[PDB]
Write a protein that binds this ligand. Structure first.
Ligand SMILES: O=C(/C=C/c1ccc(O)c(O)c1)O[C@@H](Cc1ccc(O)c(O)c1)C(=O)O
Ligand SMILES: O=C(/C=C/c1ccc(O)c(O)c1)O[C@H](Cc1ccc(O)c(O)c1)C(=O)O
Ligand SMILES: O=C(/C=C/c1ccc(O)c(O)c1)O[C@H](Cc1ccc(O)c(O)c1)C(=O)O
Ligand SMILES: *[C@@H]1O[C@H](CO)[C@@H](O)[C@H](O)[C@H]1NC(C)=O
Length: 344
C-alpha cells in the first residue's frame, strides 16, 4: 500500500482550498522514483466546476480521501505484475485541480476555486527531497489521460527546479500515457475552445519554449502533444492507442459501419501514426481503448511482439539501436483490433 501525506505547505491546495497531497511507498534499496499524475477531465467555468463539485468531489477536494491506496500496474511492487520497475519508490499524486495540471492561481475574493496543478507538482517534489528523493538517480514523471498531458506540460519544469535547487545528478524523464490528442475535425460543444477558456480561468502555464513559439493568446496549442513534444528537452516516452476512446468521444463518434465513418476512422489512425513518426520512444497499438499503465493486466498488450514493460526497459538501456530491444513500436495495420493482443 501507498500512504497518504497531505502537503506541509497548506497554501498549495485542491480546488476548494483543502490541502493537496501524495501517496508514497518507499523502497530504500532503490534509487529510482516514479511520480504518477492521475487524470479525469477538467472544468472551465463557474457553472461547469460547480457541477463537478456535486458529483466528482474527490477530483476537487482532499476532504474525503482515504488514508491508503493500492499500487497497480506500473505502480505495483510485485515483479509478476510490474516487470519494469517493481522495486522503485512509488508516488501517486491525486488530481484535485481540474486544470490538466497547468494552473497557478489561488482561491481569493475574486476566485471561487483554486487552480494550482503546476504548483502541486513542484511542492510534491520539494517535500520528497527530504524523504529520500535527494539520493535519486532517475525521476520518472508518468501520468494517464489528463495526467499524460500533464507530463508533457510539466516534465521540463521539474528538471529545471531540481537543477536550480542543486541536484544535478537526478535524471528527469517523462512517460505520457493516453494524453496525445489531435485538434481535428469532428465526425458530426467545442473541445478546442474549452481549453482556450480554461487557460484563462485557471491562469494556466505551459512550457517556456512552446510559449515562445506560439506567443500571446495561443498557449492552447501547447496542450496538444504533437505541438509541444518537439520543444521539450527531457526524454519522454509516449504511449497512445491509435483509436483512443476519448479522442473518438470528442469527435462525436459512437459505435454496421458505413463508408463515411469507415474512412473517418481509418484517417484518424493514419494521422496519429504520422504524428509519432519522429517520436523515437513510443508504443502505439491499433486498438479502440483508453488508458494503459496503471491497470493490473498492462503486461498483456504487444506491438510487433514486444510488450510495454519490455519497451520501457529497452528505453532505460538506450539512455545509458539495440539488438532485439526496440523502443519505437507503432502499429501499421489500419483498423481497431487488427492487433490480436488488444484489450478485450
Ligand atoms: O496470434 C497471435 C496472438 C498474440 C497475442 C494475443 C493476445 C495477447 O494478450 C498477447 O500477448 C499476444 O500471435 C501473433 C504473433 C506473435 C505473438 C507473440 C509474440 O511474442 C510474437 O513474436 C509474435 C500473430 O498474430 O500471429
Ligand atoms: O482524455 C480526456 C480528454 C481528452 C480531450 C481531447 C481533446 C480535447 O480538445 C479536449 O478538450 C479533451 O479525458 C479522459 C477521460 C475519458 C474520456 C472519454 C472516454 O471515452 C473515457 O473512457 C475516458 C480523462 O482525463 O480521464
Ligand atoms: O504481422 C503479423 C504477423 C507476422 C508473423 C510472422 C511470422 C510468424 O511466425 C508469426 O507468428 C507472425 O501480424 C500483424 C498483426 C499483429 C500481431 C501482433 C502484434 O503484436 C502486432 O502489433 C500486430 C499483421 O498482420 O499486421
Ligand atoms: C507555500 O506555497 C506558496 C505558493 O506556492 C508559496 O508562495 C509559499 O512561499 C510557500 N511557503 C513556504 C514556506 O515555502
Amino acid at each position: 500500500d501507498l500512504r497518504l501525506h497531505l502537503l506541509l505547505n497548506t497554501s498549495v491546495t485542491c480546488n476548494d482550498g483543502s490541502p493537496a497531497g501524495y501517496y508514497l511507498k518507499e523502497s530504500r534499496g532503490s534509487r529510482r522514483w516514479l511520480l504518477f499524475l492521475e487524470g479525469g477531465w477538467y472544468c472551465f467555468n463557474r457553472e461547469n466546476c460547480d457541477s463537478r463539485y456535486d458529483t466528482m468531489r474527490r477530483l476537487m477536494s482532499s476532504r474525503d480521501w482515504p488514508r491508503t491506496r493500492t499500487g497497480t500496474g506500473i505502480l505495483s511492487s510485485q515483479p509478476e505484475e510490474n516487470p519494469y520497475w517493481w522495486n522503485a519508490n512509488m508516488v501517486f499524486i491525486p488530481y484535485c485541480s481540474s486544470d490538466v495540471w497547468s494552473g497557478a492561481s489561488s482561491k481569493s475574493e475574486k476566485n471561487e476555486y483554486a487552480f494550482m496543478g503546476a504548483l502541486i507538482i513542484q511542492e510534491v517534489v520539494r517535500e520528497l527531497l527530504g524523504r529520500g528523493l535527494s539520493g535519486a538517480k532517475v525521476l520518472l514523471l508518468a501520468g494517464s489521460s489528463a495526467g499524460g498531458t500533464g507530463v508533457l506540460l510539466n516534465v521540463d519544469r521539474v528538471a529545471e527546479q531540481l537543477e536550480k535547487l542543486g541536484y544535478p545528478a537526478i535524471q528527469v524523464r517523462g512517460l505520457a500515457d493516453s494524453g496525445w490528442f489531435l485538434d481535428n475535425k469532428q465526425y458530426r460543444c467545442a473541445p478546442t475552445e474549452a481549453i482556450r477558456r480554461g487557460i484563462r480561468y485557471w491562469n494556466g502555464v505551459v512550457p517556456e519554449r512552446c510559449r515562445r513559439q506560439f506567443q500571446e493568446g495561443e498557449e492552447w496549442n501547447c496542450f496538444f502533444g504533437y505541438k509541444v513534444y518537439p520543444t521539450l528537452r527531457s526524454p519522454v516516452f509516449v504511449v497512445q492507442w491509435l483509436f483512443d476512446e476519448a479522442q473518438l468521444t470528442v469527435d462525436n463518434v459512437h459505435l454496421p459501419v458505413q463508408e463515411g465513418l469507415r474512412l473517418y476512422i481509418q484517417n484518424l489512425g493514419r494521422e496519429l501514426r504520422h504524428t509519432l513518426k519522429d517520436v523515437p520512444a513510443s508504443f502505439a497499438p491499433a486498438c479502440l481503448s483508453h488508458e494503459i499503465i496503471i491497470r493490473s493486466h498492462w503486461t498483456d498488450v504487444q506491438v510487433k511482439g514486444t510488450s510495454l514493460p519490455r519497451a520501457l526497459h529497452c528505453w532505460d538501456r538506450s539512455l545509458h539501436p539495440l539488438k532485439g530491444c526496440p523502443v519505437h513500436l507503432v502499429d501499421s495495420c489500419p483498423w481497431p483490433h487488427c492487433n490480436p493482443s488488444c484489450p478485450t
